[PDB]
Amino acid sequence: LTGTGVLTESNKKFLPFQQFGRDIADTTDAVRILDITPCSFGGV
Amino acid sequence: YFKIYSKHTPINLVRDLPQGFSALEPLVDLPIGINITRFQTLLALHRS
Secondary structure, three states: OOOOEEEOOOOOOOOOOOEEEOHHOOEEEEEEEEEEOOOOOOOO | EEEEEOOOOOOOOOOOOOOOOOOOOOEEEOOOOOOOOOOOOOOOOOOO
C-alpha cells in the first residue's frame, strides 16, 4: 500500500497474527512495529 | 481459509457455561481452508 507519511516509533503492541493497524474510517496510522503519521500540513 | 482461535479462562464453577465475556485471538491460521461437513472430538480416557 503506497502512501506518503513520517514513520514513527510505536508504543502500541501488535499480535503475531496482526501486521496492520487502522483507526476509524480505515485510516492507516500503524504498520508492522511502526506508526504512520503524515508530515506537517496546513493552510497559509 | 480455516481459522482456529484459542483462549483460556480460569473458573471454579463445577459444570456451567462460564460467566462474563470471552474474546478469542487466533493461535494459527490454516491456508488450505477445506470445508468440513461433520466433526468429532477426541477424549482421553484415563485408566489405572
